[PDB]
C-alpha cells in the first residue's frame, strides 16, 4: 500500500536477522531491492517461489499497483503502439487482460494500431501575477524600516 | 616520598586560591545579578558554564588531597547565609575555614562520607533565596561525585545525589523563582545530570523512566515561557528514542515541537544532526543533506572533537545517495586515520562501476560499519551505484540516444534501461525527458529565466535577514 | 545586498562600542 | 566545549582534486592518447 | 583577438553578428564594496575578539 | 664542491624510481661520487644500487686526512690567533662546514652552520650561510628547513643588501614549482629572465628558460601573454636554438592542435625525466588538453566534433570520451550531443555571472555575521 517511507524505517527494530537467516523477511527485503535499481523483472519471475504461506491476496495488490503505475507512465504523452508492446511492457500474450485495460483504461485497437491521447496542459500563464505580492512586500520594508523605533 | 611527596606541596595552594576564587567571583557576581539588574543571562553564568563543561572537569576529578578540593567540603559543610547576621557569620567562616585548609588537614571525606558532605550543605540552616547558590554548588561536587570513575556504589550515590538536587529543582519550580529564574542554569544542570544519568540506566535497565520525568519535565518548560528550556529538554528527550535501535522515528515525524527559535550557537547545531538523521531514513535525500550541511557550518569550533567527524560522516552517505562527493580527507587528523579509509574507499568503489569491490569492502570494513551504526547502506546504496552513472551522463550529454546508454551504463539492454531513466525521472534525479518515437532521450532546455524572475526570491531573505540583524542590535543596545 | 548589509554592519559597530562602555564604566565604578 | 557525541575522532598534498576527477587511465599519455594514429 | 564581435557556426556555416551591454558598471562596483565589507566584519571579531 | 652538485640529485631520482632507467647514469656517477671524495650521502644509494665495493676503506682514510689536515688548522688558529668575527678562525671553520656539504652529511654541516651564523656581524656572510642552509635543503627536500630560511631571507637580512636577492628570486618560485604552485607565483618572478650566468645561485640557464616557459602557459593564455613570452626579445633568443619549445610553443598560440599535441606528448616525456617531478607529469597535460579546448570551444556556439575529426587529430570516439569527463568534471563550459553530432555550448551573461558571485559573497558574509552576531550577547 506504498508506505515506503514506513517501509525502511520499520525495518530498524530488525538486528541481524535479515542477513543470516529468515527468508520469511528475506524475501520482501530482497523484494523491494528489486523496486530499487530498474529492475520490474526480477519481481515477476520471483513470483513462483515463495518460500512461505501463499502470500497470493497481498502480491496481488503489490503488482496491481505496479502495473496501473507503468500504465500512468504509459498514459502519458506516448502516443501509438501495438498489442504486442503491451505484451512486453505490461505483460501476458492475450488473456482478457487487454479487455481489462480496454475498459479501466482506454487504449482502444484501432487498425492494429493502439491509441492513447496527449494527457499535457496548457500551462496557463501571465508572470506578472506577482504584481499585488510584491507590492506587498515592499511595503514591509519601509513598514520595518520607519514605524518601530 | 623524597621524589613524589616533595612534590606534594606545589598541587595544592594556587588551586587553594585561584580555583577558589573562581566560584567566590562567580556566587558572587550571580547573587549580583539575581538581586538588582533581574535580567541576568549576561554574567559571567555563561563562561563558568564554559568551564564547568572544559575547565572544573579537568583542574580537578579526584578531590586533590592535602586540602584543595578535599576542604571543599568541609569548607561548604556549615553554610547558613541566612540574615544579615547569619551572612557576617558565615563571612566569618569564609575567612576562618579557608586559613585552616590552607594551612592543616580539614575533615577529608574518603570518597563515600561525600554525601553526609551533602546534607549539612542542604541542612545547617541553608535557604531557600540563594536558590543559585544551593543549585550550583550542589551540582558542580557532583562531577568529581561521577568523573571518580570506579563507578562501584557511587553508581547508586549518583542516583541519590542527583534526586536530591532534582526534589530541590522541582520544588524551585513549585516555589515560584521570583526574578532569578534558575533554567538558564538549570537547563545544562538538567543535562549534566542526565547525560550520565542516561549512563547509568545503560549499565542497568532502560531509561524510559527518565523520558516518563522528561515528559512531564517539558511540560512544566514552555508553557511557563521558554529561557533555553524547550531547547536543551528536547535535544535529550530525542536522543534516547535515536539511541533505541526500536521503531522510534514516527514518534520523532509526529513530534510537533520544531521551535527552540534561538539555542546561543551550540544546541542548534546538534539539533540539525539529530533531525537531519531522521529525515535521512524516511529517504527524503534533498532536504536531509542540506540540513546536515548546515550543522557542519554552524559550530565547527573546537580542535578534532569527533562529532564534527560524526556530522561530517553522514553528510557524505546522503550524498553518495545523490551523487556528488568533495574533498573529505583534507583535515586529516591522528584519529581520523581510522575513520578516512573505508569512507574515502567506499566512494572510490562508487564513482566506477565496479560492484566486486563494493561488495569486498563491505564485507572487510562491515564491522567498522556496525561501530557507526550504519548498516543500512548496502540495502540503499546499490540504488545509486546504477544512478550515478546516468546522473553523470545526463549532465554530460544533451541529446542522447538510448541504444549509447546501454553500453555506456554497461547494461548491454537498452529495453530495461528505459525503465532506469523512467525511475530516475520518477524520482526526480535528472530533470530530462524522454522521446519515445525513435529512441531519444534529450536533456532540458537552455539556462532559463533564472536571470530575470528569480533572483528577487532570493533577495527577499536577505533583506528580512539582515533588517533583524539590524533590530537585534538595536534592542538589545543599552544597558546603561 | 548594499542597503540591507551597510545598515546591519553600523549598527553591530553600535553594540560592541556600547558593550565596552558599559562594563569598563563598571569595573572602574569600585 | 565537550557536545558527548565525540567518543571516536608533494605526498598526497593536493591529491583528491586530481584523484576525484581522473585516477588510473593510463597516465603516461602516449600510449593511445598519443598513439591513435596507426587507426588512420 | 576581440577585433570582432560575432560568433560561428558548424552544423551551418554561419557567421552571426551581435552587440553587448556596457551597464556592467553597476554590478561591477557592487561586488567590489563586499570585499570592503568583507574586512571590516574580519576587523570588528578581531576587537570583539580582544575584549568581551 | 656545491656549484653543479644538483645534478647529483637529479641522477639520485633518475636511477631510483625508474629501474629500466639504469643504464648510464650509474656508469657516470660511481665515477663521480670516487671524485670530490663523496663519502657519506651515498650508503643510502649504495642500498638501492649496485651492491657494495671496496674502496670505501680507501676513501675513508682519504676523508680523515683531509678532515685532520684541517683539524690541526683551525685548532691552532683559534688557540694562537684571537681576531675573529669574519676573520681567519671564521673562512677556516667554514671550511669545515663546506667539507661537509661536499663530502659529508647534512648532520656536522648544519651545526657548523648555526654555530657559524651565531658568530657574525657582516649580513653577507651572514646570507651566505643562508644560501648554504637553502640548497642543502633544496637537495633533500627538507620542507621544514626551507621555511624558516626564506623567512630568515627576507625579513631578518633582506632590508639592507641589494642585487644579490634575485638569486632567491630564481629560488623562491623554484620551490613553488615543486611545490603544487604551478599556476602564478612560479610563473610571475621567473619572468625576470635576465640572470645568465650558469653559477651555483644561478644554477642552470637553458634549462631555466624551459622551466620558465613550461610554467608560463597556465598563469594567462590571453591576457597578454604574447608580450612576456613572445614579444619578448631575450626569452625569444634562446627558444631559437631549442626547435621543439619554439615549436610547442607556437602550435598553442597560432592555433594549430594537430602539431601541438605531438609536441605535447614530447614534452611529457621529456618532462619524465625531472627531479622536481612528482607534482608534474599527471596534473600538467591534463591542464593543458582542457586549456586548448576553452579557446578552441571559445568563437563558436555550434560546432559538430566531425570538424574535430581530422583539424584537430583523429578519434572520432576519443574527443567524444575525453569531453565527457571534462563536462562532468566541473569545467569545460558546453554540453556534447549525439545523432545531431553538434557540440553545443553555454556561457553566462553580464547577469548570470554577476548574480552568481554575488550570491556567493553575499552568503558567506551573512554566515560570517550570523556567528558575530552571537558572539556578543552572550
Not at chain 1, 488473456?95 to 492494429?112: H, I, Q
Not at chain 2, 522510534?248 to 542548534?268: H, T
Not at chain 2, 575513520?339 to 562508487?350: D, E, G, H, K, R
Amino acid at each position: 500500500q506504498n508506505r515506503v517511507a514506513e517501509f525502511h524505517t520499520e525495518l530498524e527494530r530488525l538486528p541481524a536477522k535479515d542477513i543470516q537467516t529468515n527468508v520469511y523477511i528475506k524475501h520482501p527485503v530482497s523484494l523491494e531491492q528489486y523496486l530499487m535499481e530498474g529492475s520490474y523483472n526480477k519481481v515477476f519471475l520471483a513470483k513462483g517461489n515463495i518460500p512461505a504461506e501463499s502470500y497470493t491476496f497481498f502480491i496481488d495488490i503489490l503488482l496491481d499497483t505496479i502495473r496501473d503505475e507503468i500504465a500512468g507512465c504509459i498514459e502519458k504523452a506516448y502516443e501509438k503502439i501495438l498489442f504486442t508492446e503491451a505484451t512486453r511492457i505490461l505483460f501476458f500474450n492475450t488473456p482478457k487482460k487487454m479487455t481489462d485495460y480496454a475498459k479501466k483504461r482506454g487504449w482502444v485497437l484501432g487498425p492494429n494500431n493502439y491509441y492513447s491521447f496527449a494527457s499535457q496542459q496548457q500551462k496557463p500563464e501571465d508572470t506578472t501575477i506577482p504584481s499585488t505580492e510584491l507590492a506587498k512586500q515592499v511595503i514591509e520594508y519601509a513598514r520595518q524600516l520607519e514605524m518601530i523605533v | 616520598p623524597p621524589g613524589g611527596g616533595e612534590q606534594e606541596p606545589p598541587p595544592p595552594p594556587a588551586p587553594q586560591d585561584v580555583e577558589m576564587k573562581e566560584e567566590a567571583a562567580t556566587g558572587g557576581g550571580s547573587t549580583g545579578e539575581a538581586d538588582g539588574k533581574t535580567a541576568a543571562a549576561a554574567a559571567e553564568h555563561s563562561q563558568r558554564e564554559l568551564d564547568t563543561v572544559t575547565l572544573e572537569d579537568i583542574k580537578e576529578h579526584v578531590k586533590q588531597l592535602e586540602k584543595a578540593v578535599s576542604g571543599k567540603e568541609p569548607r561548604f559543610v556549615l553554610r547558613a547565609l541566612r540574615m544579615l547576621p547569619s551572612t557576617s557569620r558565615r563571612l566569618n567562616h569564609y575567612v576562618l575555614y579557608k586559613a585552616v585548609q590552607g594551612f592543616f588537614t580539614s575533615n577529608n571525606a574518603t570518597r563515600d562520607f561525600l554525601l553526609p558532605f551533602l546534607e549539612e550543605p542542604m541542612d545547617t540552616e541553608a535557604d531557600l533565596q540563594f536558590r543559585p547558590r544551593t543549585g550550583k554548588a550542589a551540582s558542580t561536587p557532583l562531577l568529581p561525585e561521577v568523573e571518580a570513575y570506579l563507578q562501584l556504589l557511587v553508581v547508586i550515590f549518583m542516583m541519590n545525589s542527583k534526586r536530591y538536587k532534582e526534589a530541590q529543582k522541582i520544588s524551585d519550580d513549585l516555589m515560584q523563582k521570583i526574578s532569578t529564574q534558575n533554567r538558564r542554569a538549570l537547563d545544562l544542570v538538567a543535562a549534566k545530570c542526565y547525560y550520565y544519568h542516561a549512563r547509568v540506566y545503560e549499565f542497568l535497565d532502560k531509561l524510559d523512566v527518565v523520558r516518563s520525568f522528561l515528559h512531564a519535565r517539558l511540560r512544566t518548560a514552555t508553557l511557563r515561557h521558554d529561557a533555553d528550556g524547550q531547547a536543551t529538554l528536547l535535544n535529550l528527550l530525542l536522543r534516547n528514542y535515536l539511541h533505541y535501535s526500536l521503531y522510534d522515528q514516527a514518534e520523532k515525524l509526529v513530534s510537533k515541537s520544531v521551535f527552540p527559535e534561538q539555542a546561543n550557537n551550540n544546541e542548534w547545531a546538534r539539533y540539525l544532526y539529530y533531525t537531519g538523521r531522521i529525515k535521512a531514513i524516511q529517504l527524503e535525500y534533498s532536504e536531509a543533506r542540506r540540513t546536515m550541511t548546515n550543522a557542519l557550518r554552524k559550530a565547527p569550533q573546537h580542535t578534532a572533537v569527533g562529532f564534527k567527524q560524526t556530522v561530517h560522516k553522514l553528510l557524505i552517505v546522503v550524498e553518495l545517495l545523490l551523487g556528488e562527493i568533495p574533498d573529505r580527507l583534507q583535515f586529516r587528523q591522528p584519529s581520523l586515520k581510522r575513520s578516512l579509509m573505508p569512507y574515502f574507499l567506499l566512494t572510490q568503489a562508487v564513482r566506477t562501476g565496479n560492484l566486486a569491490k563494493f561488495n569486498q569492502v563491505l564485507d572487510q570494513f562491515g564491522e567498522k560499519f556496525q561501530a557507526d551504526g550504519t548498516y543500512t547502506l548496502i540495502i540503499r546504496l546499490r540504488h545509486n551505484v546504477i544512478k550515478t552513472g546516468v546522473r553523470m551522463i545526463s549532465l554530460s550529454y544533451s541529446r542522447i540516444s538510448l541504444a549509447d546508454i546501454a553500453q555506456k551504463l554497461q547494461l548491454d539492454s537498452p529495453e530495461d534501461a528505459e525503465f532506469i531513466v523512467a525511475k530516475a525521472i520518477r524520482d526526480g534525479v535528472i530533470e530530462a525527458s524522454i522521446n519515445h518515437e525513435k529512441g531519444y532521450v534529450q536533456s532540458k532546455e537552455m539556462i532559463d529565466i533564472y536571470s530575470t524572475r528569480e533572483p528577487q526570491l532570493a533577495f527577499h531573505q536577505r533583506i528580512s535577514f539582515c533588517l533583524d540583524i539590524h533590530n537585534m542590535s538595536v534592542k538589545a543596545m543599552r544597558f546603561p | 545586498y548594499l542597503a540591507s548589509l551597510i545598515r546591519s554592519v553600523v549598527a553591530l559597530h553600535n553594540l560592541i562600542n556600547n558593550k565596552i562602555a558599559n562594563r569598563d564604566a563598571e569595573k572602574k565604578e569600585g | 566545549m565537550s557536545e558527548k557525541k565525540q567518543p571516536v575522532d608533494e605526498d598526497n598534498w593536493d591529491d583528491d582534486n586530481v584523484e576525484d576527477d581522473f585516477s588510473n587511465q593510463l597516465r603516461a599519455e602516449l600510449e593511445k592518447h598519443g598513439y591513435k594514429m596507426e587507426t588512420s | 583577438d576581440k577585433k570582432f564581435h560575432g560568433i560561428l557556426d558548424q552544423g551551418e556555416g554561419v557567421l552571426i553578428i551581435f552587440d553587448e551591454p556596457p551597464v556592467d558598471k553597476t554590478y561591477e562596483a557592487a561586488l567590489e564594496t563586499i570585499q570592503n565589507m568583507s574586512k571590516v566584519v574580519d576587523s570588528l571579531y578581531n576587537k570583539a575578539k580582544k575584549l568581551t | 664542491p656545491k656549484n653543479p652538485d644538483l645534478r647529483i640529485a637529479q641522477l639520485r631520482f633518475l636511477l631510483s624510481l625508474p629501474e629500466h632507467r639504469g643504464d648510464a647514469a650509474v656508469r657516470d656517477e660511481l665515477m663521480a661520487a670516487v671524485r670530490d671524495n663523496n663519502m657519506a650521502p651515498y650508503y643510502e644509494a649504495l642500498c638501492k644500487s649496485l651492491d657494495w665495493q671496496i674502496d670505501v676503506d680507501l676513501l675513508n682514510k682519504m676523508k680523515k686526512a683531509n678532515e685532520d689536515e684541517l683539524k690541526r688548522l683551525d685548532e691552532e688558529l683559534e688557540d694562537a690567533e684571537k681576531n675573529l668575527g669574519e676573520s681567519e678562525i671564521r673562512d677556516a671553520m667554514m671550511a669545515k662546514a663546506e667539507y661537509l656539504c661536499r663530502i659529508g652529511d647534512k648532520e656536522g654541516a648544519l651545526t657548523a652552520f648555526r654555530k657559524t651564523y651565531d658568530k657574525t656581524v657582516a649580513l653577507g656572510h651572514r646570507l651566505d650561510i643562508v644560501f648554504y642552509l637553502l640548497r642543502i635543503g633544496l637537495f633533500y627536500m627538507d620542507n621544514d628547513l626551507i621555511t624558516r630560511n626564506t623567512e630568515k631571507a627576507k625579513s631578518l637580512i633582506e632590508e639592507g643588501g641589494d642585487w644579490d636577492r634575485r638569486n632567491r628570486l630564481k629560488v623562491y618560485q623554484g620551490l613553488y614549482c615543486v611545490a603544487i604552485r604551478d599556476f602564478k607565483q612560479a610563473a610571475e618572478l621567473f619572468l625576470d629572465t635576465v640572470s645568465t650566468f650558469t653559477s651555483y645561485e644561478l644554477m642552470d640557464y637553458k634549462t631555466f628558460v624551459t622551466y620558465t616557459v613550461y610554467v608560463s602557459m597556465i598563469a594567462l593564455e590571453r591576457p597578454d601573454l604574447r608580450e612576456k613570452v613572445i614579444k619578448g626579445a631575450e626569452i625569444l633568443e634562446v627558444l631559437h636554438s631549442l626547435p621543439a619549445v619554439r615549436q610547442y610553443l607556437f602550435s598553442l598560440y597560432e592555433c594549430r592542435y594537430s602539431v601541438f599535441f605531438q609536441s605535447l606528448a614530447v614534452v611529457e616525456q621529456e618532462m619524465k625525466k625531472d627531479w622536481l617531478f612528482a607534482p608534474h607529469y599527471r596534473y600538467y597535460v591534463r591542464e593543458m588538453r582542457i586549456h586548448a579546448y576553452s579557446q578552441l570551444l571559445e568563437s563558436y556556439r555550434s560546432l559538430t566534433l566531425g570538424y574535430m575529426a581530422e583539424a584537430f587529430g583523429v578519434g572520432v570516439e576519443f574527443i567524444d570520451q575525453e569531453l565527457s569527463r571534462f563536462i562532468a568534471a566541473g569545467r569545460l563550459h558546453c554540453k556534447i550531443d549525439k545523432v545531431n553530432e553538434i557540440v553545443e555550448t553555454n556561457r553566462p551573461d553580464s547577469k548570470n555571472w554577476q548574480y552568481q558571485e554575488t550570491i556567493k559573497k553575499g552568503d558567506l558574509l551573512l554566515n560570517r555575521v550570523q556567528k558575530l552576531s552571537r558572539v556578543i550577547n552572550m
